[PDB]
Coordinates of C-alpha atoms in Angstrom, one line a residue:
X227 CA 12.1 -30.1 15.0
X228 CA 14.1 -27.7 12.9
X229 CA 10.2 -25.6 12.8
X230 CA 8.0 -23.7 14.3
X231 CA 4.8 -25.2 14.9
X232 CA 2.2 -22.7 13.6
X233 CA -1.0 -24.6 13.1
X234 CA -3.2 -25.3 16.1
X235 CA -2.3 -21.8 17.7
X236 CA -3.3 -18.4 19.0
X237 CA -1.3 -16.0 17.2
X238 CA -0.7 -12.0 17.3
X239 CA 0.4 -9.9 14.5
X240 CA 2.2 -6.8 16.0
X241 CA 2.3 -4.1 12.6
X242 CA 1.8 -0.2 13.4
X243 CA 3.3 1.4 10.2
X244 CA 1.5 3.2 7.2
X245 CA -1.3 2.6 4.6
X246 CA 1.8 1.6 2.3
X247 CA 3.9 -0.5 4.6
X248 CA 0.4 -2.3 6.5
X249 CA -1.2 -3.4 2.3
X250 CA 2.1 -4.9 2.0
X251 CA 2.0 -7.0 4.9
X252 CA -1.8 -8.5 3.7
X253 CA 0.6 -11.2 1.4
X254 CA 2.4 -12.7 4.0
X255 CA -1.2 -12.7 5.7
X256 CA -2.4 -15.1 3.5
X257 CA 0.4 -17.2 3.6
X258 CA 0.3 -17.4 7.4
X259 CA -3.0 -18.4 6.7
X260 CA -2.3 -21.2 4.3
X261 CA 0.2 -23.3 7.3
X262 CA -1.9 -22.3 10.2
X263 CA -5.2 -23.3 8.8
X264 CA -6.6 -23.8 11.8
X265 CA -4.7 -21.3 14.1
X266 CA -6.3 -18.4 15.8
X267 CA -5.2 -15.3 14.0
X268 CA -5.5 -11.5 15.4
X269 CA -3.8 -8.6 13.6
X270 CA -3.0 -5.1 15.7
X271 CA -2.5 -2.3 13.4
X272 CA -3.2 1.6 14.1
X273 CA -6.9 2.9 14.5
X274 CA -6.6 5.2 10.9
X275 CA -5.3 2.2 8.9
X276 CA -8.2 -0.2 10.4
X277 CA -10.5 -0.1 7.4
X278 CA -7.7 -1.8 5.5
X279 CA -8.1 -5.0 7.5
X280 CA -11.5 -5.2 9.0
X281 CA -12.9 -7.2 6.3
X282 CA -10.0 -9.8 5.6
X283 CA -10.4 -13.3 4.8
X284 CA -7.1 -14.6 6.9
X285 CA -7.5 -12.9 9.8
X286 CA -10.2 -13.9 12.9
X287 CA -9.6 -10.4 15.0
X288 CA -8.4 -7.1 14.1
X289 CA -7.1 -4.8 17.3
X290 CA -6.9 -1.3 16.9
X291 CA -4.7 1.5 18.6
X292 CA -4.3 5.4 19.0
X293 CA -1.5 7.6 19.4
X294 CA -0.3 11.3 19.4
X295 CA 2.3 11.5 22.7
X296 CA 4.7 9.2 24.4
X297 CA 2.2 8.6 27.6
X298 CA -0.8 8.3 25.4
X299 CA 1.0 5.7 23.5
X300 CA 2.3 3.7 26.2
X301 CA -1.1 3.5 28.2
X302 CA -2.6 2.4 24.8
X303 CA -0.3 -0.5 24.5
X304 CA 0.0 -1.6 27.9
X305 CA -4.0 -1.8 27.2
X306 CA -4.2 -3.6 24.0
X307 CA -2.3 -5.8 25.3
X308 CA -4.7 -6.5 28.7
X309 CA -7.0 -6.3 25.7
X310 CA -5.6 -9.6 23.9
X311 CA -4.8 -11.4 26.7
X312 CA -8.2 -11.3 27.8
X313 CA -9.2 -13.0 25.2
X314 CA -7.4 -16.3 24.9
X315 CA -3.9 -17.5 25.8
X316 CA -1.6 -16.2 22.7
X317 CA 0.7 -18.8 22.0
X318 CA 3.0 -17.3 19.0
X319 CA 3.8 -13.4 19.2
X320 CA 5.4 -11.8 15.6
X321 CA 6.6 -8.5 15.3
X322 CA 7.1 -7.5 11.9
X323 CA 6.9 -3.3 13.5
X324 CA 11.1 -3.2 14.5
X325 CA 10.9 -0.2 16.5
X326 CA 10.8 0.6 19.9
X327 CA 7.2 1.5 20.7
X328 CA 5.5 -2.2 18.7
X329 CA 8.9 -4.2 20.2
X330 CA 7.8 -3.1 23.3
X331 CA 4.2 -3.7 22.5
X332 CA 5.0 -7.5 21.4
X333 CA 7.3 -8.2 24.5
X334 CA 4.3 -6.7 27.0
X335 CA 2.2 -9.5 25.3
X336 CA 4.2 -11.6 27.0
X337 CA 3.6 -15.0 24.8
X338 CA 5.2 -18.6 25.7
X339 CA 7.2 -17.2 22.4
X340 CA 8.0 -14.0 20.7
X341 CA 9.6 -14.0 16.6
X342 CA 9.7 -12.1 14.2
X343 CA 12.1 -8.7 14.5
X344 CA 11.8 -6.3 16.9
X345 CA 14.3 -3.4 18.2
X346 CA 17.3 -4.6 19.6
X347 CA 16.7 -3.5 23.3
X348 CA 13.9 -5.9 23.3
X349 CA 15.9 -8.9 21.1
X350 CA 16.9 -10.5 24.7
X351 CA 13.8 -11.4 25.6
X352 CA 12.5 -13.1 22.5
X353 CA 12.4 -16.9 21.2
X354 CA 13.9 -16.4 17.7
X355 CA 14.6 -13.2 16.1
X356 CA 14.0 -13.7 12.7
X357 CA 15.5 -10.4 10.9
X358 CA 14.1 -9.1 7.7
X359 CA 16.0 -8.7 4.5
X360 CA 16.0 -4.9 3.3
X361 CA 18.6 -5.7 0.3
X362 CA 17.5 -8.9 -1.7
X363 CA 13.7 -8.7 -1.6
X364 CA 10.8 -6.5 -2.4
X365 CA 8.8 -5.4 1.2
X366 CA 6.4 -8.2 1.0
X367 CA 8.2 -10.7 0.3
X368 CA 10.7 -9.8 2.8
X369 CA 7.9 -10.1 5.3
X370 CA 7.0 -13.9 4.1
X371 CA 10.4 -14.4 4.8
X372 CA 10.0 -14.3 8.1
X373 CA 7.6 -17.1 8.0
X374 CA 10.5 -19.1 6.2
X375 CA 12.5 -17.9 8.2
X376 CA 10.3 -20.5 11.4
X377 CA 10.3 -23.0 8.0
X378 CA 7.0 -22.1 5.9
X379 CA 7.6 -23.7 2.3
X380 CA 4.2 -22.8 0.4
X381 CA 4.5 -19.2 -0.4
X382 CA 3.2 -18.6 -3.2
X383 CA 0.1 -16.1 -2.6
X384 CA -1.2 -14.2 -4.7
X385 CA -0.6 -10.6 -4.4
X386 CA -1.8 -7.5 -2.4
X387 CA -6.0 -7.6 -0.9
X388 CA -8.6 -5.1 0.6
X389 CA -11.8 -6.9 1.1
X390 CA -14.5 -4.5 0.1
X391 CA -17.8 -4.5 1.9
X392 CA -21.2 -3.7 0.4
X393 CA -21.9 -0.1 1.8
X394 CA -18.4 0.8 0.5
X395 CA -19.1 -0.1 -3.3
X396 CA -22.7 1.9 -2.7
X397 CA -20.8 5.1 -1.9
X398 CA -19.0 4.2 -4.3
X399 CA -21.5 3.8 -6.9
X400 CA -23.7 6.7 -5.9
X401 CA -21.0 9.4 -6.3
X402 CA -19.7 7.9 -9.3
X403 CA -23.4 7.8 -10.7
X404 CA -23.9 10.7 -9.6
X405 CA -21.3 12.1 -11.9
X406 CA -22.7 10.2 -14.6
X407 CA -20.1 7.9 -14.8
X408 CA -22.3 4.4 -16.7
X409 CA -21.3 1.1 -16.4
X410 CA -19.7 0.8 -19.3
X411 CA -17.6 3.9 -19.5
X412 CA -13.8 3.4 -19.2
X413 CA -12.2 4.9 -16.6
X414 CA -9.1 6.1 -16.0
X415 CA -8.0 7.3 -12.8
X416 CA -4.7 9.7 -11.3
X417 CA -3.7 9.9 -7.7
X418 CA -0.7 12.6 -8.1
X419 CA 0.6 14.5 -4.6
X420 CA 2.6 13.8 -1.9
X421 CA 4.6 15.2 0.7
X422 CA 7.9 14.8 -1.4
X423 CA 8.6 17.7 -4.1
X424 CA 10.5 15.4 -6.3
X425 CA 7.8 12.9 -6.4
X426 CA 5.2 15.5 -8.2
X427 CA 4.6 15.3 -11.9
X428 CA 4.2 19.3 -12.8
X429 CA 1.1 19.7 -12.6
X430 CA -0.2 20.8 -16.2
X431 CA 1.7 17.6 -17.6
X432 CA -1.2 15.6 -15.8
X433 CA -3.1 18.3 -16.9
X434 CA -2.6 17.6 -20.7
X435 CA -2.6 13.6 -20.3
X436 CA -5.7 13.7 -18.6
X437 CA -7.3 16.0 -21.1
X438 CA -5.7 13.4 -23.3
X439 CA -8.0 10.5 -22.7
X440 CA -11.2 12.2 -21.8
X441 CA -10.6 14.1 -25.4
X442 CA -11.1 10.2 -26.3
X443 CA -13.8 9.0 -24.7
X444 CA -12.4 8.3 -21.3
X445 CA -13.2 9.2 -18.1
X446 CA -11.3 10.6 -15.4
X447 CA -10.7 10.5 -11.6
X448 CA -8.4 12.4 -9.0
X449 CA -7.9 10.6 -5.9
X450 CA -6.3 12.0 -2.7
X451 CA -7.0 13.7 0.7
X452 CA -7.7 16.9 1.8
X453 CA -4.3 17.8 1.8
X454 CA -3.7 16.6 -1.9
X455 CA -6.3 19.4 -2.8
X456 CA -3.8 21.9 -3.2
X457 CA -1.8 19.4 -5.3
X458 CA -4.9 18.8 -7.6
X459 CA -6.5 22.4 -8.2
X460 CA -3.8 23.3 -10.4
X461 CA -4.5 20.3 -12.7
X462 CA -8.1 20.6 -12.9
X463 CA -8.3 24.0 -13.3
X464 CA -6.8 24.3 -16.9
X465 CA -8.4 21.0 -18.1
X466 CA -10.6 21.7 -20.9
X467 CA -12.6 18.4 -20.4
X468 CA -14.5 17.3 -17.1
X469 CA -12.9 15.3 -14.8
X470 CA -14.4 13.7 -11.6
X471 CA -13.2 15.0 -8.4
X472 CA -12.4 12.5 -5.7
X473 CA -9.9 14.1 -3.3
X474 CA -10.4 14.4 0.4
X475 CA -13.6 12.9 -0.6
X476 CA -13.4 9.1 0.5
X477 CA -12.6 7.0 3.6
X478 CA -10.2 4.1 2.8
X479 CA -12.6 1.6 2.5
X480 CA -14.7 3.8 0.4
X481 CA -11.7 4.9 -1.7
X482 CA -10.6 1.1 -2.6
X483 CA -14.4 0.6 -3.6
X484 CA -13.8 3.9 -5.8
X485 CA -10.2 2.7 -7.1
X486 CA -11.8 -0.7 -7.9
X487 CA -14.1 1.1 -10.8
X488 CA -11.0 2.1 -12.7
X489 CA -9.8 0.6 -16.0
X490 CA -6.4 2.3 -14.9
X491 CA -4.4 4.2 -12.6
X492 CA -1.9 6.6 -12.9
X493 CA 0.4 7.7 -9.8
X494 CA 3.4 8.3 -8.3
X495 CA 5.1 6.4 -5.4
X496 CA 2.7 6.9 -2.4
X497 CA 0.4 4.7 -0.8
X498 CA -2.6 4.8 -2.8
X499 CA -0.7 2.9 -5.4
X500 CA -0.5 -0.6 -3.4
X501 CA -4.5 0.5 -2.6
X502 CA -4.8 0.3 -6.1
X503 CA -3.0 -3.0 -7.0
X504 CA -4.7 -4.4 -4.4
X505 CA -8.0 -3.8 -6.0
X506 CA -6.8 -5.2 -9.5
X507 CA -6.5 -1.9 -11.5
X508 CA -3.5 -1.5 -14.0
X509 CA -0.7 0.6 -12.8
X510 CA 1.3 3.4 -14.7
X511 CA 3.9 4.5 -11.7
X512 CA 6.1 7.4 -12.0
X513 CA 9.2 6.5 -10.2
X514 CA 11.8 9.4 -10.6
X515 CA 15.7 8.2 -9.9
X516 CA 14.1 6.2 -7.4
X517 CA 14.3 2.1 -7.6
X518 CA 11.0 0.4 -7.3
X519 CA 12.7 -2.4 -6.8
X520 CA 11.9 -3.2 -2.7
X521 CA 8.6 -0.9 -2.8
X522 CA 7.0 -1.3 -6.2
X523 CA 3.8 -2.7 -7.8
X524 CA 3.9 -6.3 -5.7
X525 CA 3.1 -9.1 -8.1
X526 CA 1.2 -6.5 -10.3
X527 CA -0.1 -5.6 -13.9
X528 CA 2.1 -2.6 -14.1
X529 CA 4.5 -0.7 -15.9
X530 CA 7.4 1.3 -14.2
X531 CA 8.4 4.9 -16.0
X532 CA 11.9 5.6 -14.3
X533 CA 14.7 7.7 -15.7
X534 CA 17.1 5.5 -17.8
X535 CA 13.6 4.6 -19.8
X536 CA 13.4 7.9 -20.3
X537 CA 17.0 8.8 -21.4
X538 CA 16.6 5.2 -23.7
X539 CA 13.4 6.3 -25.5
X540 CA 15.6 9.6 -25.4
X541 CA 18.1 8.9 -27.4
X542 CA 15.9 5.9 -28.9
X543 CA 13.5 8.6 -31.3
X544 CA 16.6 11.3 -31.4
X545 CA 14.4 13.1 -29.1
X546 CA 16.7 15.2 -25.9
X547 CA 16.1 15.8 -22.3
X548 CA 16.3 19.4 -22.4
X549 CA 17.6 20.4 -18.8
X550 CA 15.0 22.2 -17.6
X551 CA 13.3 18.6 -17.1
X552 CA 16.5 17.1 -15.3
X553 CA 15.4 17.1 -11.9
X554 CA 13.1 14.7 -10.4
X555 CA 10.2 13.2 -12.2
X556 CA 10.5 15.9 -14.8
X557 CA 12.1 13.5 -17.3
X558 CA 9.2 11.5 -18.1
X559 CA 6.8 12.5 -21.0
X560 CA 3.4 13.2 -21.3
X561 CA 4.4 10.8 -24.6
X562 CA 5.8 8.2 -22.1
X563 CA 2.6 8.0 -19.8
X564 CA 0.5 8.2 -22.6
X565 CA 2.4 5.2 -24.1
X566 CA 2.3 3.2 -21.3
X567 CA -1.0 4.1 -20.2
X568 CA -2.6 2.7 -23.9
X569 CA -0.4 -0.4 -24.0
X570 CA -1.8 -1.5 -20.2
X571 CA -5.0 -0.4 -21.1
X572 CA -5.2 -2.8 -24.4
X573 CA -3.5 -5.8 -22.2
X574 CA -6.0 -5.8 -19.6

């Protein structure tokens, strides 16, 4: 037939890429599910990322692995492999990881059949090489399209996971107690900082909006890790109102159990944004000149500032641009997020 047989199997899920790009691939993940109901399922991501996954409702054995060198690597591969195939006789390999360290990982598996996409010096050796579509659909749905690619009809899933355990929503709720955060207080959370310059909102414009809401009634959270501390002091420091500090300060378990507890989440392109969709929480998401289009809020309760919305409402309330804010995110408003921010938090 003009399918792949998926139900009934033993199947590996080769994925080694980051926070961002792994939360994206939990969709499809359900939707492999959904026509291999009965299949053996084991996922292989990268030991940092592994808290993402452990606790997953589609998935019957998670594999982790290290890295740092090109030797290091290699033996750790060659091994996870031994490692899977002394557990069961994989019938279906998928590589969704197209570069040369996870193709070769997927080909040393050496199942009956290999799919999915995988670098071109390993293409030869594979069963069909289903390639992913970087131009027509957002990253998670061009990973489900793999799975029609080998036929799968049923896609509909419904948007980005991390199952949370118990422990995690205790750490969670002790340090958010512990800064007298009550049950019913409404919180609204930030996770600004990353490695890119032009994705970084100056930092006393987060300052003000913050200082915004907490002047309300709401309170506030800043996300991050240790090396978004540098990125943060500057905020907090010329807030007039208390915010909670969260930075460097939660594993990524813990942090989703944290994210859960917000009413709302402001943030640039990074990561911690799909965390946050994945845990239900209402998304503000400063995109600069950048198109969310492939990597935005997946399937999500959300609200994109980019810059022609900002030259619109420009011109919209007479209001200009002056050119000191041209480059980079420095055309959105305090005004905009604020906006944006109330109208979420209302239709939630």
């Amino acid at each position: 037939s003009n399918a792949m047989e998926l139900d009934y199997k033993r199947i590996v899920v080769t994925f080694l890429m980051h926070l961002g790009d792994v939360i994206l691939t939990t969709p499809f993940l359900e939707v492999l599910r959904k026509a291999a109901p009965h299949s053996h399922i084991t996922y292989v991501i990268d030991e940092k990322l592994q808290q993402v996954m452990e606790y997953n409702p589609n998935i019957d054995e998670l594999i982790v692995v290290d890295k740092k060198g090109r030797h290091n690597s290699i033996s750790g591969l060659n091994e996870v492999a031994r490692e899977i195939n002394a557990k069961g006789k994989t019938d279906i390999v998928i590589n969704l990881h197209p570069n040369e360290r996870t193709s070769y990982l997927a080909w040393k598996i050496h199942a009956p059949i290999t799919t999915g996409m995988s670098h071109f010096l390993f293409r030869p050796f594979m069963t069909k090489y289903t390639r992913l579509d970087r131009k027509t659909r957002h990253a998670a749905d061009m990973y489900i399209n793999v799975l029609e690619q080998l036929g799968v009809t049923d896609t509909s899933n419904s948007g980005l996971h991390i199952e949370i355990c118990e422990e995690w929503r205790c750490q969670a709720q002790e340090f958010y107690s512990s800064h007298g955060l009550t049950d019913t207080d409404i919180l609204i959370g930030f996770n600004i900082g990353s490695a890119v310059p032009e994705k970084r909102w100056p930092a006393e414009r987060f300052a003000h909006v913050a200082d915004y809401f907490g002047r309300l009634g709401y309170k506030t959270v800043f996300f991050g890790g240790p090396m978004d501390l540098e990125m943060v002091q500057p905020v907090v420091e010329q807030m007039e109102t208390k915010p909670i500090v969260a930075t460097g300060k939660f594993q990524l378990g813990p942090l989703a159990a944290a994210m859960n507890r917000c009413n709302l989440l402001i943030t640039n392109d990074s990561g911690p944004m799909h965390v946050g969709i994945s845990q239900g929480v209402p998304i503000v998401a400063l995109y600069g000149p950048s198109n969310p289009f492939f990597y935005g809020p997946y399937q999500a309760h959300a609200i994109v500032l980019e810059t022609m919305d900002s030259y619109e409402i420009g011109k919209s309330m007479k209001k200009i641009i002056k050119e000191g804010n041209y480059k980079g995110l420095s055309v959105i408003s305090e005004e905009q997020v604020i906006k944006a921010a109330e109208t979420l938090l209302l239709e939630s």
